[PDB]
What we know:
It is classed as membrane protein. Keywords: calcium channel, ryanodine receptor, receptor. This is part of a larger assembly, with 3 copies of chain A. By secondary structure, chain A is mostly helical. Chain A is built from 3 helices and no strands. At the B-C interface, strand 3, helix 19, helix 21 and helix 22 of B face helix 4, helix 5 and helix 6 of C. The complex binds calcium ion and zinc ion (2 copies).
Amino acid sequence: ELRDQQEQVKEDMETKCFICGIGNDYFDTVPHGFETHTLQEHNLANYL
Amino acid sequence: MESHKHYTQSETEFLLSCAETDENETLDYEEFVKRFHEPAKDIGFNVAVLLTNLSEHMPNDTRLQTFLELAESVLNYFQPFLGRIEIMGSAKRIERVYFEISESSRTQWEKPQVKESKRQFIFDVVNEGGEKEKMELFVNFCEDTIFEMQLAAQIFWKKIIAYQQKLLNYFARNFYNMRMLALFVAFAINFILLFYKVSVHYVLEESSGYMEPTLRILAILHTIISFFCIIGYYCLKVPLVIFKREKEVARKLEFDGLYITEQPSEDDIKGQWDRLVINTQSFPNNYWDKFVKRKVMDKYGEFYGRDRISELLGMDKAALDFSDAREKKKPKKDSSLSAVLNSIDVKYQMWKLGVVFTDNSFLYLAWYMTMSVLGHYNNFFFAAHLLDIAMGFKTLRTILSSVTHNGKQLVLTVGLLAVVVYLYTVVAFNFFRKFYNKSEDGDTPDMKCDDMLTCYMFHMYVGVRAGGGIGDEIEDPAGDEYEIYRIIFDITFFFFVIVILLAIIQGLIIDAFGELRDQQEQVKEDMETKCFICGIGNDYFDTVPHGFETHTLQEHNLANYLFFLMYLINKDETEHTGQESYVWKMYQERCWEFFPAGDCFRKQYE
Amino acid sequence: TMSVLGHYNNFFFAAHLLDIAMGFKTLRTILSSVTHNGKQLVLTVGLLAVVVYLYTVVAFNFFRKFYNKSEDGDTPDMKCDDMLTCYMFHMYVGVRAGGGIGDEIEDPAGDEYEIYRIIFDITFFFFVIVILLAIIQGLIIDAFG
Ligand SMILES: [Ca+2]
Ligand SMILES: [Zn+2]
Ligand SMILES: [Zn+2]
């Protein structure tokens, strides 16, 4: 259970936005869409 | 022709009107079909794709219905010859393009090695690849597979070369049966080695003749079969991997500028080994693309120095060779008269060697060869050849991949086991050192605890495998001086070391095995109940009978897409249609938006 | 035919007790489970046999003086002076011993081969006992589930 919680946290950080949490498939339309959305638009470092 | 029930009398007499009557009442039908069938076939294919387009666009018209019954009467011949693709581009709508598929292409697709390449691509693109680079990997697979098909179709100086080439071709064609024959001979040799005995003096005693010399015969035969397997592999599968690497490095040079502006890192040995021959003479030897050098020169010459680019990319002092070949080029040139050998480039040969010696399969074959050679010295080394079934079968490969899967976790849990065993060893060496007397009569006590290294070895060797802790094998306390502490020591040992850490390791291997099996069956289920190209799903097509099967075998066939790419490559451009030229431009600019992402013809129209 | 053969030897009527296995539902489930993962079970048993044969060959080559299954003798009952005998002894004792193979043959207690013998037994108790038997057990239990 501890291992599964760790990997689930990792999967949620990889395939879901932290701030809005709209999902991944919505941004999986243009190339590199979700990655650019998480690195430019909704960056936690940017919010800080 | 009139009794075969495929011709009426009018057709029979019309075809007899085409006779030759070579003054002896005789025609040679070879000549007949050699002259009267090919253009008929071509124009029939053209009108067939026309009628197919008209049908599959405009349905349900009685006039078009009789035209369509005639169409299908023609199409019963052109069914395995026309392929259809669903492009999405240039109109924001799904377009069904039609093209021709060659019989040679169909045969090369039926060939075995392309089938194994296809199944491997499917597996490693459904397991590792997602959807961002799925079309990238699919186009790369199509290119590698058309190169595979070209190679398979390809499969004093005019007396030895023409024969040794045929020998290499036979080896490459007979590589797999050579592997099965090798496994047979290894099984036979290991059965003979099983029928064995000992006198210090090795002897095959359990037999009465007819078995001693056959061991040596089967040994030398196994060795020659290993050599033939390796030699056939080097000419069957090494071209493919070297072409893949050449394509990768050439596209990295052209697009990204890996050795022009984006010099690779220190640990990527692949980057250094490719930099080794980014400047060789025959760099794109198998990528069939012999102008990547000039392309990258024209791309990065006006910014980083044309002289420096021509120096670091090979072909030095030849910046005007293009103009020299365009204006009054040389017609041809004889090979040589004094230089019969050493014409090949030693740098490119060394690069090919360094790339094949890291293939992870040529290495396995070389291990097989050296194990056979060592078995020639000591016949018992032929037992290592029994592990060939572990790589030949699927579930045994799964077990091996499972024992390798959770590598870091397995190493770390074994380390924690060692550390806790060392803790128990130290506490037993300090306090409970008088109980480790592994003797029954002696009278010399065999104290296994009068030494730290000996006690730790004894612990990690006996207490972990005893299945019941460590105190079921060393003497019981039976004395109220340390009994409670000794009892706690053993229950703690039998807990942490036996029923916890070993259990965790066992679970690690079994869960890795189960995860690998589940990934395999999930790949199978996704290939069975989901489309590869569009991936709309199954239930959408589960409306008409055989709907999804016909959709996957006719509309969105991966073989059809590959044949369409091959047709575009061998289409002799300036003759492309609108859709064909559009798809070719997209493929040249490396965009791949012409694949139907989340739509199809049925979802677009009625 | 089992009834007819029981007419000859009355103890053949014991095969008729397996009728409950077909009459009940969960016993039919257990039988269908032992038959379900057929190919996987055969292949994992084969891998077990091959790794046991590997251990048999290495023990026959190097550690052949430890397989003395006698207490007084004085005739040594060497179970390793023969490949077929050693392989049979291995696949019969080391797989069912529940603790590897060295809990039933003599301990090294000598700095001539002790470390290699120790590695041999931990590797055996790993791959043969707590891995392959466990994989087979899991195969049947997961088929049943
Ligand atoms: Ca044109
Ligand atoms: Zn967001
Ligand atoms: Zn589809």
